[PDB]
């Protein structure tokens, strides 16, 4: 709705930084509303959904198992790892690692899963093969959050990410069981409360994944809809602002409040 576009634009002026936005129809894949849809933004932790998509693709191919336990050690740890640090003496399964990466943005879980698929280069190859010729991962955690201006490493475009998410959640790219698992992890997201979820009215469905990086970078990807089922995908990214986290959160919440209003 044109009004939401007013709010997105307002957000850019208030933050002093570019904001990218897409609202997509989940069924048809049509762009409903957009702002800077083809500009690049750092993915931050939103890439972890794409990662677990690649892992699920391996499981569908019989090359991986959700129940497989991975035993790792201190050399593997990086900071911002609340779940993997606790499970150090006794391992975590691939299912637990994807849950920690998606729902808690656990950085060690993401690196461990990147190891299982062959690293950032292989995630980029998977994306290309799925028809996403723009999104690229180059680095591992924590460096992928650097957000150097005009640095194209570890970026996506709002429109590419939206279409990619739609294909992970609804194509035959993944099996039905895998599509259900991916969206179940996203629905269980624990760290995105201050964003879209804060504007979401009782009865609505949302499955989402947030990200935060250096240089004021912040973003969220989501599938959401009324009456307990998703029907649109929304992607919001920003980078370069000096605003505080609360302040950045608040702008994203308000964009959420407007697309909810004008649905």
């Amino acid at each position: 709705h044109p009004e939401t576009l007013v709010k997105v634009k307002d957000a850019e002026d208030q933050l002093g930084a570019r904001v990218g936005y897409i609202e997509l129809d989940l069924n048809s894949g049509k762009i409903l509303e957009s702002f800077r849809p083809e500009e690049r933004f750092p993915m931050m932790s939103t890439f972890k959904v794409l990662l677990c998509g690649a892992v699920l693709s391996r499981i569908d191919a019989g090359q991986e198992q959700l129940g497989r336990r991975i035993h790792y050690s201190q050399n593997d740890l990086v900071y911002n790892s609340p779940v993997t640090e606790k499970h150090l003496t006794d391992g975590m399964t691939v299912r637990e690692l994807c849950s920690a990466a998606i729902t808690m943005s656990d950085n060690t879980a993401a690196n461990l899963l990147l190891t299982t698929i062959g690293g950032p280069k292989e995630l980029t190859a998977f994306l290309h093969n799925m028809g996403d010729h723009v999104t690229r991962l180059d680095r591992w955690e924590p460096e992928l959050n650097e957000a150097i201006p005009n640095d194209e490493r570890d970026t996506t475009m709002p429109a590419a990410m939206a279409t990619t998410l739609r294909k992970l959640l609804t194509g035959e790219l993944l099996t039905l069981a895998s599509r259900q698992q991916l969206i179940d992890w996203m629905e269980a997201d624990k760290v995105a409360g201050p964003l879209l979820r804060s504007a979401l009215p009782a009865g609505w469905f949302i499955a989402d994944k947030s990200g935060a990086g250096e240089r004021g970078s912040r973003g969220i990807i989501a599938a959401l809809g009324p009456d307990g089922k998703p029907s649109r995908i929304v992607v919001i990214y920003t980078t370069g602002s000096q605003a505080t986290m609360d302040e950045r959160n608040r702008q994203i919440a308000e964009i959420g409040a407007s697309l909810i209003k004008h649905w």
Binding site: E85, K86, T89, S105, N145, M245
Partner: protein, 165 residues
């Protein structure tokens, strides 16, 4: 009593009960089960991804279990951080904790985790230190020059660094 903090972390002691942990941290801030198993995980200033926290590990799932592990991120600030890339490269595996502190700076480190797998015995103690250059630490959870130094029975087993100059 507010969210979880560095002060509450330091007050909590090995050997404490679950109820003592909840009472000090403030039970509203804490959880057990789910992603965290037997442990009690207490959230600090959040803001979203990468929020400050502590996790306390217990000897068993029993209601009467005792604290055998303390871990935290973004709750404790180094008292005088002076680590550098130079100094990091001078640290060697097999050094004692004292030798390491003499190499990286007495005020450069905080405790990331400390675990007693044979509690009440202290044999096999594991200790992870987070160590910071002069501007490396941040309570906002993005560091700019930090290292992980890990020990068993007080002897350095390994090290890793991000973004030291």
């Amino acid at each position: 009593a507010g969210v979880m903090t560095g002060a509450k972390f330091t007050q909590i002691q090995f050997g404490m009960t679950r109820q003592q942990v909840l009472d000090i941290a403030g039970a509203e801030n804490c959880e057990t089960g789910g992603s965290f198993g037997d442990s009690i995980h207490c959230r600090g200033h959040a803001a979203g991804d990468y929020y400050a926290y502590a996790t306390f590990g217990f000897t068993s799932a029993a209601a009467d279990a005792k604290v055998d592990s303390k871990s935290q991120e973004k709750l404790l600030a180094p008292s005088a951080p002076t680590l550098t890339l130079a100094k990091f490269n001078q640290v060697t595996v097999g050094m004692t904790r004292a030798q390491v502190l003499a190499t990286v700076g007495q005020g450069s480190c905080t405790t990331w985790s400390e675990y007693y797998p044979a509690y009440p015995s202290t044999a096999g103690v594991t200790l992870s230190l987070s160590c910071f250059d002069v501007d490396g630490y941040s309570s906002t959870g993005f560091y700019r020059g930090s290292a992980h130094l890990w020990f068993t029975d007080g002897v350095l087993q390994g090290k890793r660094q991000w973004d030291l100059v």
